Amino acid sequence: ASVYAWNRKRISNCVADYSVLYNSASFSTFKCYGVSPTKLNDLCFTNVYA
């Protein structure tokens, strides 16, 4: 979607698998704030927003 009307998908009640983030080749920026990118598979989150 356009940046002015950005899509928000709520993520909850799932087994978070971040393998897509590590296996993909297309990503140019993979910045993380407050968490470490490699440790995302060892954390439990109350709720996620994409």
Added chain:
Amino acid sequence: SALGKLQDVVNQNAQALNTLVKQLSSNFGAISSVLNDILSRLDPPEAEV
């Protein structure tokens, strides 16, 4: 309340100890007030800060 002087020492010390333990739940500007969470989600460079 006749033994107020003795009760004061017990209250002052218990309050001081309670205040000490309650300080373990303060961020002091950090992301979390618990070391395990900071170590769990941060790399050694950022965790050190």
